[PDB]
Write a protein that binds this ligand. Structure first.
Ligand SMILES: [Zn+2]
Ligand SMILES: [Zn+2]
Ligand SMILES: [Zn+2]
Ligand SMILES: [Zn+2]
Ligand SMILES: [Zn+2]
Ligand SMILES: [Zn+2]
Lengths: 73, 73
């Protein structure tokens, strides 16, 4: 739609998605909802325990824009 | 990303941002970089001369967490 960074926050043992195809570096990650509302088919992704932090969806400095979800473009 | 308080220090006449929507009390403030890397759209913020002190971004005791920047969550 017309018109944001996700910024959703993880606690120590919250899971997220690592996508090695979309990440700017090895510490980037996106929340499960942003992963499920994007397109990572044939990407090299894995479920991870975050150790805390925040989702990088929407942040071009941390995540490749073709990897953004429908809500953070 | 995965993984802090900002703690950046101001001198007497250094500017920072007051955000009345995010602050825990009237003496809190965040540095310009933390302001620019957060989301305060439609918040009641102002540029101020600090009189010294330190940025509250990342410190839940001084600043509402939805007001933190991308680097201090
Ligand atoms: Zn997200
Ligand atoms: Zn997203
Ligand atoms: Zn991907
Ligand atoms: Zn700061
Ligand atoms: Zn910050
Ligand atoms: Zn604010």
């Amino acid at each position: 739609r017309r018109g944001g960074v996700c910024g959703s926050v993880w606690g120590q043992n919250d899971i997220a998605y690592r996508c090695r195809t979309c990440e700017n570096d090895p510490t980037c990650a996106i929340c499960v909802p942003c992963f499920q509302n994007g397109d990572h088919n044939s990407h090299d992704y894995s479920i991870i325990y975050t150790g805390g932090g925040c989702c990088d969806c929407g942040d071009e400095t941390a995540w490749k824009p073709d990897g953004f979800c429908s809500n953070h473009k």
